[PDB]
Design a protein around this nucleic acid. Structure first.
Length: 17
RNA sequence: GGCUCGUGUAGCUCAUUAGCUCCGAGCC
């Protein structure tokens, strides 16, 4: 998690599914 | 790692509604 959640899994695999 | 899929028991960035790495899927 960051200053929002996670954005992604690091090769475009974008998070909040 | 090169790339693609899966919030998941998760971390690290500073994003930009995100990003990169895990923890698995599949093949280098």
């Amino acid at each position: 998690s960051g200053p929002r959640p996670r954005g992604t899994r690091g090769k475009g695999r974008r998070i909040r599914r």
